[PDB]
């Protein structure tokens, strides 16, 4: 996020980091329950990647994070890689997250819910702060 | 480039798809929602994470960080997967697995 600010630690408890085998953070995701994460299809997650829950500072070793294996990647087969449309994947975890102060689920909308232009929302992540 | 160690956040507005098309044209599909162009931007490494809106006291997943400006310009809208268009598939997938 460019021109954002640091979050209060633990205040976005559904936010996960997707890390590859080398420990590199490459994408975010959101817990929707203890067994499932929603992310983008274009992130290209595999069962060799790891979901990291409960994290704030990726440079700290003192956070009680949960490193969760991925059992199966469910890419929405409406996903169109040419247009990047329908850009959603579900990750089924091999072992459930343990919900806590700092690890819990985001709500999902009904398909008929209205989120009007002009509404102020929030986005979160460990993406670049400067290109 | 700078990658942060610490989790970042930004507030930003939702756009209409019609208005977002003034920036991105026919790249904008119904299963996308644009947000930003407001002095902040999602950027590389944010992909897959949440765009949440607070409704009746609870944060609800409205978007999934998807794509946008290749330089993360804060004057151009970011593009997010529109969760309302995708949630039926989420529920079907959970039910079947």
């Amino acid at each position: 996020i460019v021109n954002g600010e640091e979050a209060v630690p633990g205040s976005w408890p559904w936010q996960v980091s997707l890390q590859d085998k080398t420990g590199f953070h490459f994408c975010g995701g959101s817990l929707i329950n203890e067994n499932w994460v929603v992310t983008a299809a274009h992130c290209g997650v595999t069962t060799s990647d790891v979901v990291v829950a409960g994290e704030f500072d990726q440079g700290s070793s003192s956070e009680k994070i949960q490193k969760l294996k991925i059992a199966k990647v469910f890419k929405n087969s409406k996903y169109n890689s040419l247009t990047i449309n329908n850009d959603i994947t579900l990750l089924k975890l091999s072992t459930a997250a343990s919900f806590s102060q700092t690890v819990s689920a985001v709500c999902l909308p009904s398909a008929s819910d209205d989120f009007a232009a002009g509404t102020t929302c929030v986005t979160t992540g460990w993406g670049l702060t400067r290109y | 480039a700078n990658t942060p160690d610490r989790l970042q956040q930004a507030s930003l507005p939702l756009l209409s798809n019609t208005n977002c098309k003034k920036y991105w044209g026919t790249k904008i599909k119904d299963a996308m929602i644009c947000a930003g162009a407001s002095g902040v931007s999602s950027c590389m490494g944010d992909s897959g994470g949440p765009l949440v809106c607070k409704k009746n006291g609870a944060w609800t997943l409205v978007g999934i960080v998807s794509w946008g400006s290749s330089t993360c310009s804060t004057s151009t809208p970011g593009v997010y997967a529109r969760v309302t268009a995708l949630v039926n598939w989420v529920q079907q997938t959970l039910a079947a697995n």
């Binding site: 274009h42 | 590389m44 960080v65």
Partner: peptide, 4 residues
Amino acid sequence: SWPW
């Protein structure tokens, strides 16, 4: 444009 670029994936994010």
